């Protein structure tokens, strides 16, 4: 990569499946080398070793290094210092959990455990920031109220709580998109949607302009138009 | 002025004050509100 | 951590369980009274019904719906609002009288153009005649009641002391008593004004029977629901408690691992 | 920071991250075979932070009118607060 970025002055990228594999392999050798691997059973040279790898793929004037880093979560918890330390050297995360896979939503990306230092009110503009802000907030109310929603039914609660519950359910199904290479497995045709389109499609949903129509209209579709058509397909 | 308003008040009057059976006290002058509305616009709740 | 977040949530669930259990007892308490009231009302209604049968009466429209102020009594509150919207296809410009807070919000939203009269104080205590009488009076002023060709009321008939089915009947108007027999199988000339007076006293007796039936059926639902509530909060205790047990063990293990790691090395 | 405070002029020190000092010192201690405390973190980590933090303080104007003010920042793992650091 470095040869491409520097000398030759190419615009580079890197994708890795998987970078956790660097710590794990390294940890086996750690004991043997002359190190005491205590840090919840990990090499003590974690910081220094992850640092050299992720700073040799850091953006230069010679060429900007777009990284995609793939993290294997040790025993499904992000709490241990080795999954935590990855978040430190990143400017974006789009964390994918087991749970969203069970709910039948592919992709399995969490909406509430995603970040960017790229989302502000004039970086991507006023509309993008407002639209994201309503989405995060809505969803966080629905999980917060899950004990109460499940224990006591949804024709027993307030006007405000039922309106959220229906909206959040619609956004939940919407998140499902089959991809160009995932189309095979689900059996639902690929959908490729633009960022510009995504802002629009969500602004409309948030104002309730398409929440009078099935929550399964939004199951395995791309953008807004794809939703509209599938409801009529579903109806007849 | 309904017929049942007239009988109600005639009843309430025979009941006086608290020294009457429990049912009596319940059939007359226990608080509650009734908010009227129009058509929207709303006359403000006054005692039952 | 994991540990604490597990725990504080498991504690909320425990607190929920204690309240739903207390609620279910309070509901049986209220329920006995609710049952008591409805017997007594129905008995009174049957004497008036007696007349209505012989009179053969049987005929703008009204919608009345019944709930408490209190939430947490089955899906009584939103199936009754749905039953209003059904009988709003029978007369779209019908005057919705909403008896109770829970029913008031949802119908008020769909049409504030149908909300005329609404009530409060249905939830703290079981319906009483005072309410019914005054509401019957206000029915003449606001809705111009007793000139309709049909009036109708909705409630929940408490089929068995653990069940509820929603049911409806039509309140027979003063105009109806006038033009069916009431000199042809009874006898009143023009001395009193028995029709317009019997309508008004019996507007409240029939309205009150529906109020009682609905309220009784309602506490049975809150009782049924709170029993299921305890059991569900209980299922949740069990998933988080097993999660807690495993987590708590993970700390123990982790302290143990740190000691061994150093001594051995 | 202290040099400003010493001559008479106020200052403020933001310390991001002290949490990372502790990661670095953990590496040092365990490859220097110095016993750990809890969670593989050094025996006397608190002493390294504690002296460090009290060098932010308000001095008397007779002896330098300045003060260094301090805001340490600790980036916590799963919002946890029952660990040693």
**DSSP string over C190-254:** SSS-HHHHHHHHHHHHHHHHHHHHHHHHHHHHHHHHHHHHHHHHHHHHHHHHHHHHHHHHHHHHH
- Report CB contact under 8 Å: D20, A47: yes
Provide the residue range defining the domain that includes A144.
119-236
Residue among C261, C262, C263, C264 with most chain A CBs within 10 A, to mutate? C261
From C91's Cα to the closest Cα of chain B, the distance in A is 15
- Structural domain boundaries of chain B? 1-48
Complete DSSP assignment for A7-21? TS---EEEE-S-SHH
Chain C residue nearest residue D83, CA to CA: C1
Residues C128, B26: C-beta atoms closer than 8 Å: yes
Using the Cβ of D20 and the Cβ atoms of chain C, whether some distance falls under 8 Å is answered with no
CA distance D53 to A65: 38
Q: Of all helices (H) and strands (E), which one includes residue D24?
A: helix D19-30
Name the residue in chain A with its Cα closest to that of D22. Answer: A47
Phi and psi angles of residue C126, each rounded to the nearest 5 degrees, phi first: -75, 140
Yes or no, beta carbons of C120 and B34 under 8 Å apart: yes
Of A41, A150, A156, the CB nearest to C77: A156
Of A39, A44, A47, the CB nearest to D31: A44
Give the residue among D3, D23, D6, D15 at the shortest CA–CA distance from D65. Answer: D6
CA C73 to CA C220: how far, in whole Å? Answer: 8
Q: Is the Cβ–Cβ distance between A198 and A166 less than 8 Å?
A: no
For residue A33, what is the nearest residue in chain D, using CA coordinates? D31
Q: After which residues does chain B have a break in its backbone, defined as C to next N over 2.5 Å?
A: 16, 39
- Which residues of A are less than 8 Å from C225 in CB distance? 152-153, 156
Burial of C109 (0-12, 13-18, 19+ CB in 10 A): exposed
Rounded to whole angstroms, how far apart are CA atoms A235 and A215? 12
> For position A139, which CATH number holds?
1.10.1140.10
Q: Do B35 and C120 touch (CB under 8 A)?
A: yes
| Chain C residue closest in CA terms to A39 | C258
Closest CA of chain C from D72, distance in Å: 21
Chain D nearest C-alpha distance from C258 (Å): 6
Nearest CA in chain C to A144: C9
Residues of C in contact with B37 (CB under 8 A): 108, 112, 115-118
| Chain D neighbors of A81, CB-CB under 8 A | 23, 77
Question: Please, what is the Cα angle at C89 between C200 and C95, to 5 degrees?
Answer: 35
Sign of CA dihedral B21, B22, B23, B25: positive
Q: How far apart are CA A143 and CA C158, in angstroms?
A: 36
Record: contact C75-A156, CB cut-off 8 A:
yes
Closest C-alpha among C103, C101, C107 to residue C120: C101
Distance in angstroms between the alpha carbons of the first and the last residue of chain D: 24
Closest CA to C145 of C188, C191, C94: C94
Q: Which residues of A touch C12 (CB under 8 A)?
A: 147
User: Which H/E stretch holds residue C42?
Assistant: helix C3-54
Nearest CA in chain C to A152: C229
CA distance D79 to chain A (A): 9
Measured CA distances, B35 to C35, C99, C120, C211 (Å): 28, 10, 7, 18
Contact B19, C145 (CB under 8 A): no
Interatomic CA distance for residues A220 and C105, integer angstroms: 36
- Integer Cα distance of D51 and D53 in angstroms: 6
Cβ-defined contact of D80 to A79 (cutoff 8 Å): yes
CB atoms within 10 A of CB A121: 12
Q: Are the CB atoms for C156 and C217 separated by under 8 Å?
A: yes
The string of DSSP codes covering A77-94 is -S-SHHHHHHHTT-SEEE
CATH number of B1-48: 1.10.1620.20
Respond yes or no on whether the N-terminal peptide bond of residue C2 is cis (omega within 30° of 0).
Answer: no
| CB atoms B2 and C200 under 8 Å | yes
Beta carbons within 10 angstroms of residue B38's beta carbon: 13
Domains defined along chain C, listed by start = 1-25+226-265 (1.10.287.80), 26-225 (3.40.1380.10)
Pick from C48, C20, C22, C74: which is nearest to C216 by CA? Answer: C74
Contact by Cβ (8 Å): C174, C150: no
Distance (Å, rounded) from C-alpha A28 to C-alpha A35? 11
Experimental method: cryo-EM
β-partners of residue C96 are C63, C115
B36 contacts in chain C (CB < 8 Å): 116-118, 138, 142
CB A220 within 8 A of CB A186: yes
B-to-C residue pairs, Cβ atoms closer than 8 angstroms: 90
Determine whether the interchain pair A79/C1 forms a contact, defined as Cβ–Cβ distance below 8 Å. Answer: yes
Identify which of A86, A133, C49, A45 has the alpha carbon closest to the alpha carbon of residue D28.
A45
Beta strand pairing call for C165-171 and D11-15:
unpaired
Q: Is C130–B28 a contact, with Cβ atoms under 8 angstroms apart?
A: yes
């Amino acid at each position: 990569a470095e040869y491409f970025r520097d000398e030759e002055g190419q615009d580079v990228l890197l994708f890795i499946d998987n970078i956790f594999r660097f710590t794990q392999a390294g940890s086996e050798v750690s004991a043997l080398l002359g190190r005491i691997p205590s840090a919840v059973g990990y090499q003590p040279t974690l910081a220094t070793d992850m640092g050299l790898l992720q700073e040799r793929i850091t953006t230069t004037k010679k060429g900007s290094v777009t990284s995609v880093q793939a993290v294997y979560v040790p025993a499904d918890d992000l709490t241990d210092p080795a999954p935590a330390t990855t978040f430190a050297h990143l400017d974006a995360t789009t964390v994918l959990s087991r749970g969203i896979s069970e709910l039948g939503i592919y992709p399995a990306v969490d909406p509430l455990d995603s970040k960017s230092r790229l989302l502000d009110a004039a970086v991507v503009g006023q509309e993008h920031y407002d639209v994201a802000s309503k989405v995060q907030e809505t969803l966080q109310t629905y999980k917060s109220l899950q004990d109460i929603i499940a224990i006591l039914g949804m024709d027993e609660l307030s006007e405000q709580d039922k309106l959220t519950v229906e909206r959040a359910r619609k956004i939940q199904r919407f998140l499902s998109q089959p991809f160009a290479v995932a189309e095979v497995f689900t059996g639902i045709p690929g959908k490729l949607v633009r960022l510009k389109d995504t802002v629009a499609s969500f602004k409309a949903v948030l104002e309730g302009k398409y929440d009078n129509i099935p929550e399964h209209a939004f199951y395995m579709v791309g953008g807004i138009e794809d939703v509209v058509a599938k409801a009529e397909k579903l109806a007849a | 002025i309904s017929y049942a308003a007239y009988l109600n008040v005639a009843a309430q009057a025979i009941r006086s004050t608290e020294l009457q059976t429990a049912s009596v006290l319940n059939r007359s002058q226990t608080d509650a509100f009734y908010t009227q509305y129009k058509n929207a616009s709303e006359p403000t709740p006054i005692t039952k | 951590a994991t540990l604490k977040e597990v725990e504080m949530r498991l504690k909320s669930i425990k607190n929920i369980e204690k309240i739903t259990k207390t609620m279910k007892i309070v509901a049986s308490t209220r329920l006995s009274k609710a049952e008591k009231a409805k017997i007594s009302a129905k008995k009174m209604d049957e004497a008036e019904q007696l007349f209505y049968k012989n009179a053969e009466t049987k005929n703008k429209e009204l919608i009345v719906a019944i709930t408490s102020d209190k939430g947490l009594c089955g899906s009584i509150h939103s199936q009754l609002a749905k039953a209003v919207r059904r009988h709003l296809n029978d007369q779209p410009n019908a005057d919705i009288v909403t008896i109770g807070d829970k029913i008031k919000m949802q119908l008020l939203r769909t049409h504030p153009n149908n909300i005329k009269l609404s009530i409060n104080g249905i939830g703290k205590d079981a319906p009483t005649f005072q309410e019914s009488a005054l509401i019957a009076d206000k029915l003449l002023s606001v809705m111009k009641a007793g000139t309709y060709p049909k009036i109708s009321i909705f409630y929940n008939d408490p089929v068995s002391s653990l069940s509820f089915e929603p049911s409806e009947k039509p309140i027979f108007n003063a105009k109806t008593i006038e033009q069916s027999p009431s000199f042809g199988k009874f006898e009143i000339d023009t001395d009193a004004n028995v029709p317009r007076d019997l309508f008004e006293y019996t507007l409240a007796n029939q309205m009150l029977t529906a109020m009682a039936q609905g309220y009784a059926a309602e506490i049975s639902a809150r009782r049924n629901a709170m029993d299921n509530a305890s059991k569900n909060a209980g299922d949740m205790i069990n998933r988080y408690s097993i999660l807690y047990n495993r987590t708590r063990q993970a700390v123990i293990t982790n302290e143990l691992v740190d000691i061994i790691t150093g001594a051995s090395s | 920071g202290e040099w400003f405070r010493d001559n008479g002029k106020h200052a403020l020190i933001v310390y991001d991250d002290l949490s990372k000092q502790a990661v670095a010192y953990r590496q040092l201690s365990l490859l220097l075979r110095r016993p750990p405390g809890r969670e593989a973190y050094p025996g006397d980590v608190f002493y390294l932070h504690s002296r460090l933090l009290e060098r932010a303080a308000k001095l008397s104007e007779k002896e330098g009118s300045g003060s260094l003010t301090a805001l340490p920042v600790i980036e916590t793992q799963g919002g946890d607060v029952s660990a040693y650091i």
